[PDB]
Amino acid sequence: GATMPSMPFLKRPSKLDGSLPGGEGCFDPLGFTEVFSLEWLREAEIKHCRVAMLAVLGVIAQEFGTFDFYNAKSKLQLSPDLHNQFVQNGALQQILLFVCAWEFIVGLPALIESVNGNREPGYFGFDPLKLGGTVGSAQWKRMQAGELRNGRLAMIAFGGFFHQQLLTKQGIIEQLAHF
Amino acid sequence: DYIKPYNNDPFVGHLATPINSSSLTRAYLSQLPIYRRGVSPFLRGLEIGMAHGYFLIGPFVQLGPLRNTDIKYLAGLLSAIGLIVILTLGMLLYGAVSFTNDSQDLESVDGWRQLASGFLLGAVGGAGFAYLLLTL
Amino acid sequence: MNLKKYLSTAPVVATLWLFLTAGILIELNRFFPDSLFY
């Protein structure tokens, strides 16, 4: 049966979105692009993907080494005590200072440009190593889709990391090794 | 449907409502000392005064400053008589300026003078009668 | 979509300028309290 147009859901009428890098799923069951700008949502999703990938790898990497010059009295990286102590010692305060500097001085102009229809969402032109190749061609759209999928997985895994640590009071590696 | 123009002619600044105009209302408004047919101005004034002073004495005797003394009734009667004199003065002034010389039909100087005299006499007599009733 | 022009209107510019002036005055008053006779 179904309607005239289809969606990967196989029971939905295709929305405005068509075939975007990593957007072949057209996963918009609840109307979010019909009222909000697509560029705004895409920029937000890519920003979330990047910050979440760094967070997932950071949580796993922090459980092995703490540099030895940071107190780190708590071995739980996603615990409020560790967040508060690192904020008090100034480490997270400095991360906040520079991350806010980037967002206001560069992030805001970047989002305004992408909202006007000039800059592709989440495109900062950062390709030190020619890994993605030419923009808008082979090795780029596929790599962009890979980035989106890895970021979504990292976002879901960060939520899992936080909830598991807060419920078991055990680290990710510690919990993986025991129960 | 009961509310109609007073004279059945619209554009008039009045309405013929139930208590405004009715069989009972028209009968009651009529026949009073005033508006009654075949009554001389002096008779109308006498009736009005004897009916006014009677109830005018009440307030002064009951709530006058000397209501607790043994002369409460006398003091109230005197106060009522004074108020009656002032009212008669007002009536006479109104007749002196509002009306002119013409036939005595209650709308002339002589007619209103007779009405004022009757009102004064009636009011004094009514106040005296009420005082007598209170004393007895 | 000329947001800059709206932000440049009299009420917006006036509120921003007065907010900055009040902030400067308050900040000076907590860093240098009870200032009198210069």
Binding site: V35 | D1, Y2, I3, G13, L15, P18, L63, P65, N68 | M1, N2, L3, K5, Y6, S8, T9, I26, N29, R30, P33
Partner: protein, 743 residues
């Protein structure tokens, strides 16, 4: 039969900032450039007047649905702010531990210019400004025990505000309903009666039964707030609810078997105030909400909507017709479906009356726990709702006049109640004016007479208990009937609805909660003063609404508009002849009436209800029985109330209440500044502005926007605004300082 269907227009208005850079775009005249300073004022004066912008009812309806959403979002933001202040900067937990000893406070002033003194020693560790909004009592009645719940509620409020923001924008730029929508008054009424109010009260009753009842029962049993089980535990573990209320053992079976009497543990009708906290029994409140929910739900199925069953408001209106009213209520349905001003007038009058009733019922029957013992909160809430109610009533009159001047139609209003009233408006206003004169004489004259007697040493000739007595026999009789109602007319009621009618007194924390409010000669005179002032203010508003279209002085006031300065210095003078000016005068009279009403409540409460109780039952009020013989004279009202009670607001300097004292002075200034705009005219200010403009011209510093004086109508508006602001602020600071310093 009409289909109650939803039809909307998509992308009717584009979302862009282009119109933000063009002030006055909504008006044809304001979009041509200012050319003078009067344009700045006109821009704000006609900003929310959607009826003046366009002549289409559909556009106005959409501009109202939206902006209603915006105001709802603003209210949700304010509520979120109150909850966040309670969670972050308030001593709510400490207050819960010791509700009688700790003073509520949720504001912390920053230390910058010596203002840190305002942080009163309210107790509970933190020091701040004592709040008299009753937020603490309300939260306690709702079952809040920890600040985490307050934080979650604040976050939920912020989310609801965001939703009300999105809804407002979506219903104006993405899906705007057509005029057919908004004209379905039957459906709107059915939903608001069964869904907004019926289901709302039902849900609140459920929350009280599952959260408020058990938590408050444990709190009143000496259990610490931290040791009380969480609200969700009472729902998951039914054993706890059964232990606290055996009725839960039977479950919902009794409800479905009509054995409602088995719910006597949770659905009680005790009738009185709780002797532990001084407020109404939460069980009686839950049962009350359940009954009001069931009654509203049943009432919500009266009108006909998309089905054969129901009623038609138009048919009911046209059916009501009598000999004294030719066409009865014919044409009123079309009036309330084609003019938002008429609906706004009716709704504003009812909402204001509801607020006034709320104030009376809230002070007499304290609903929240520990609310009666917190006299500052009681005074502030009664006075606050009294003022908001009066303002909404004056607004109701103003909008009635607006509809009469702009949306009135002779064909629609033909031989109906409205037309028949406009026909005899002279009888209405002259008879009402006569009533006002009689009331003023027999109300204020009694006070003046008492002043004259007391000054002459003739106390035996006064209108007091010792001298001539004027006892409210009717009101006293109703009080006695209420006192005896719990046993002869309320068989299932275990106590009188309010202890203010009689019964016995209630004391909580060595403080009087509610005791019989005996009425005497002073109350007789003050109540008549209240009636006199209400009559004069309603006379002013009714006169302005009845003559809004025309009068014997100005035969075409409607063509001149609803808000116009005057017709000129002709016919002897036609100043303040428009209906808007009648609203302007009604504002002062409403302020006078409301000020006297709040004055009576404050003094009577502090002299016969609020006070302390010493062991063995001895009662000592703040002002021991002085209202009985001091409220019967203007001198007493100035000496024992305005002078004696002001000592707290004038001596507040050097303490945490100093702010109030400052506000007490500032308000005065404002109230005195209003006189400037009320006893002056714009001709003089225009000439002064001419001289100042010449001075500017002499220095080549003149502005392009020609400086102009405030319009005549704008001047009147500014004067009344400043007058009301100053007066209400002065009485606000006086009330708050007096009630906080003592009691």
């Amino acid at each position: 039969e009409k289909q109650v269907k939803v039809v909307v227009d998509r992308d009717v208005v584009p979302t862009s900032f282009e119109k933000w850079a063009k002030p006055g775009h909504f008006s044809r005249s304001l979009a041509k450039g200012p050319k003078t300073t009067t344009w700045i004022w006109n821009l704000h004066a006609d900003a929310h007047d959607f009826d003046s912008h366009t002549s289409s009812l559909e556009e106005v309806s959409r501009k109202i649905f939206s902006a209603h959403f915006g105001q709802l979002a603003i209210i949700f933001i304010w509520l979120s702010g109150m909850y966040f202040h309670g969670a972050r900067f308030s001593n709510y937990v400490a207050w819960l531990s010791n509700p009688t000893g700790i003073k509520p406070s949720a504001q912390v002033v920053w230390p910058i210019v010596g203002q840190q003194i305002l942080n009163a020693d309210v107790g509970g560790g933190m020091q701040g400004i004592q709040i008299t909004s009753g937020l603490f009592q309300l939260w306690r009645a709702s079952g809040i025990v920890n600040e985490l719940q307050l934080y979650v509620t604040a976050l939920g409020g912020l989310g609801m505000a965001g939703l009300m923001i999105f809804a407002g924008w979506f219903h104006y730029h993405k899906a705007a309903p057509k005029l057919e929508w908004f004209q379905n008054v039957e459906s709107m009424l059915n939903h608001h009666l069964a869904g907004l109010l019926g289901l709302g009260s039902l849900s609140w009753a459920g929350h009280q039964i599952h959260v408020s009842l058990p938590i408050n029962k444990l709190l009143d049993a000496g259990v610490a707030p931290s040791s009380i089980p969480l609200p969700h535990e009472f729902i998951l573990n039914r054993n706890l609810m059964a232990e606290l209320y055996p009725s839960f053992q039977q479950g919902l079976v009794p409800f479905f078997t009509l054995n409602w009497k088995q719910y006597s543990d949770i659905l009680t009708f005790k009738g009185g105030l709780s002797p532990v906290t001084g407020g109404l029994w939460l069980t009686d409140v839950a049962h009350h909400h359940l009954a009001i929910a069931v009654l509203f739900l049943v009432a919500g199925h009266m009108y006909r909507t998309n089905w054969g069953i129901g009623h038609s408001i138009k048919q009911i209106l046209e059916a009501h017709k009598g000999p004294l009213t030719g066409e009865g209520h014919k044409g009123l349905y079309e009036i309330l479906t084609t003019s938002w001003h008429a609906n706004l007038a009716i709704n504003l009058a009812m909402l204001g009356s509801l607020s006034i009733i709320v104030a009376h019922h809230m002070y007499a029957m304290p609903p929240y726990p520990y609310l009666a013992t917190d006299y500052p909160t009681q005074l502030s809430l009664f006075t606050h709702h009294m003022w908001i109610g009066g303002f909404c009533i004056v607004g109701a009159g103003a909008h009635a006049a607006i509809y009469m001047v702009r949306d009135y139609s002779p064909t629609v209003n033909f031989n109906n109640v409205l037309d028949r009233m406009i026909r005899h408006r002279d009888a209405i206003i002259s008879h009402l004016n006569w009533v006002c004169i009689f009331l003023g004489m027999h109300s204020f004259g009694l006070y003046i007479h008492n002043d004259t007697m007391r000054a002459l040493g003739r106390a035996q000739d006064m209108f007091s208990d010792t001298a001539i007595q004027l006892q409210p026999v009717f009101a006293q009789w109703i009080q006695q009937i209420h006192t005896l109602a719990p046993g002869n007319t309320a068989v299932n009621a275990l106590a009188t609805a309010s202890y203010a009618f009689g019964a016995d007194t209630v004391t909580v924390g060595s403080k009087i909660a509610m005791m019989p409010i005996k009425l005497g000669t002073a109350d007789f005179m003050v109540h008549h003063i209240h009636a006199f002032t209400i009559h004069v203010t309603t006379l002013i508003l009714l006169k302005g609404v009845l003559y809004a279209r025309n009068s014997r002085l100005i035969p075409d006031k409607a063509n001149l508009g609803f808000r116009f300065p005057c017709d000129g210095p002709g016919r002897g003078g036609t100043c303040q002849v428009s209906a808007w000016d009648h609203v302007f005068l009604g504002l002062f009279w409403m302020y006078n009436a409301l000020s006297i009403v709040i004055f009576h409540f404050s003094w009577k409460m502090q002299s016969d209800v609020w006070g302390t109780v010493t062991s063995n039952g001895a009662i000592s009020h703040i002002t021991g029985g002085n209202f009985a013989q001091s409220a019967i004279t203007i001198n007493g009202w100035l000496r024992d109330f305005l002078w004696a009670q002001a000592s707290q607001v004038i001596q507040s300097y050097g303490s945490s209440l100093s702010a109030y004292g400052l506000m007490f002075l500032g308000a005065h200034f404002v109230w005195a500044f209003s006189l400037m705009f009320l006893f002056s005219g714009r001709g003089y200010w225009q000439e002064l502005i001419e001289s100042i403009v010449w001075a500017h011209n002499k220095l080549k510093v003149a502005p392009a926007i020609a400086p102009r004086a405030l319009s005549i109508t704008q001047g009147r508006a500014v004067g009344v605004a400043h007058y009301l602001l100053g007066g209400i602020a002065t009485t606000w600071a006086f009330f708050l300082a007096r009630i906080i310093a003592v009691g």
